[PDB]
């Protein structure tokens, strides 16, 4: 859709859409920027992620409302509308997964970009798994697991334990274990080990890096408190 707009203009419009909380626009602008075929900078990867996370986050919240009504009710309208929302959500996830596969991931060679995209891939398969109920639910779950696992393996080899993307990846993989894979003990173990190894590395950091890392460590702690 965005083929006639300059890459830099798409990026500037994505930033403006973020300021205006127009996340559907911002996702469309960032999709156009990706389709320009150049690799994304650190800032641009964040813009891409923020846009689609907000879009699918609203879809997930609407799906949960409608699923809650549908389970309480158990005419066809509630099922039909939950299905419509569900199809829209799957379409957004498929779009993001298609961008990662064509061709963000294969061109991402530095640890920071490759772990970022693979965490994205695990997340959007996780959102697919949240609504999956048919023949391929197991394959969807394994696709999320495999993406997260590769990202974990890279982040442990290449990143310090306080690196924000390493922390937030481990956070989301722990949520995957707890909510999707029915493995709460793995979820708890991962959140504990992630927190403790980051805590032991905090002394190496500047004031601003310390703030970035401890913020995500708080989220790990919140989950541990909820789960134990």
């Amino acid at each position: 859709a965005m083929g006639s707009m300059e890459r830099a203009s798409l990026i500037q419009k994505a930033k403006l859409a973020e300021q205006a909380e127009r996340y559907e626009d911002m996702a469309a602008f960032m999709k156009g920027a990706v389709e320009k075929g150049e690799e994304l900078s650190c800032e641009e990867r964040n813009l891409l992620s923020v846009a689609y996370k907000n879009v699918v986050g609203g879809q997930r919240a609407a799906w949960r409302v409608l699923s809650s009504i549908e389970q309480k009710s158990n005419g066809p309208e509630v099922r039909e509308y939950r299905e419509k929302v569900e199809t829209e959500l799957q379409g957004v996830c498929d779009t993001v997964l298609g961008l990662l596969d064509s061709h963000l991931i294969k061109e991402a060679g530095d640890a920071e970009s490759r772990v970022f995209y693979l965490k994205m891939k695990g997340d959007y398969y996780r959102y697919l798994a949240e609504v999956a109920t048919g023949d391929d639910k197991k394959r969807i779950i394994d696709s999320a697991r495999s993406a997260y696992q590769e990202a974990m393996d890279i982040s442990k080899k290449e990143m310090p334990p306080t690196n924000p993307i390493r922390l937030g990846l481990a956070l989301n993989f722990s949520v995957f274990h707890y909510e999707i894979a029915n493995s709460p003990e793995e979820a708890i173990s991962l959140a504990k080990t992630t927190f403790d190894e980051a805590m032991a590395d905090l002394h190496t950091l500047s004031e601003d890096s310390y703030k970035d890392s401890t913020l995500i460590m708080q989220l790990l702690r919140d989950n541990l408190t909820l789960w134990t």
Binding site: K53, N172, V175, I216, L219, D222, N223
Partner: peptide, 7 residues
């Protein structure tokens, strides 16, 4: 629900 990563 548990917290996944968010800004």
């Amino acid at each position: 629900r548990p917290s996944s990563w968010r800004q």
